[PDB]
Amino acid sequence: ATYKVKDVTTGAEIEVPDDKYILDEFEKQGVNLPYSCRAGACSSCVALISSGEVDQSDGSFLSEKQEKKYILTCCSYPKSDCTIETGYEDKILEDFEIELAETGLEFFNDLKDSLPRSGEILSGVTAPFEAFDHYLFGNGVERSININDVGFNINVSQIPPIMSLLNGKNVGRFDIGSDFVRNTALDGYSVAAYLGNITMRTEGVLNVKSDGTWQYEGVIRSYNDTYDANPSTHRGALGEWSGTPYEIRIPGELKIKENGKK
Ligand code: FES
């Protein structure tokens, strides 16, 4: 047989026969699709499949659960009419990410009939689903969440302006006041999945002694997150599982106090 496989990404619509790989056939009819290993052992050629099915048993990199929504194009034979989305490597979810997504949606549905779509976002495990629902249905209304409710786990070792002094023959008392970017994946997938990269500010004093002991004390504050979950973002990846961008105000001050030895 020969089933039609459409690609959202390139727009193409190739007739691909059940005995041939999706990548190869696309390449034959002139469509350049991404790849690297060509041996079923990475994710360079991964696509989302949103309808139809395939035989990718020839590949191994994807977990059992990944394979429900993701295919490896360099090892995939269609078994039906397929719509897919190539170029998905940079949006793919890891197993532990998919588990959190699956569980958090289940819990979100448990409160999705009385969502305010304004004010405070509810913290924790439902936040990513709440922030995304607001993206679709909130018509750009500002939202907020206190910096102490987000669930940040921030260490000195993760703050560049502090560490550029701390890794260096620097001794004495240093006042530090600077913006830095926080990739909230450091704080675990449930914060990342709605905050992504966010600009923060730390103000405090670092003491470094000749003996190598140091201590730091100060605070952290956050600028507003710009929430955009369009089709090319990680947040959009969790969504596909149009809107309007919006701000998340993150008021308050987080306190920071640590010490160590070089
Ligand atoms: S290119 Fe490595 S899995 Fe297809």
Ligand SMILES: [Cl-]
């Ligand atoms: Cl600055």
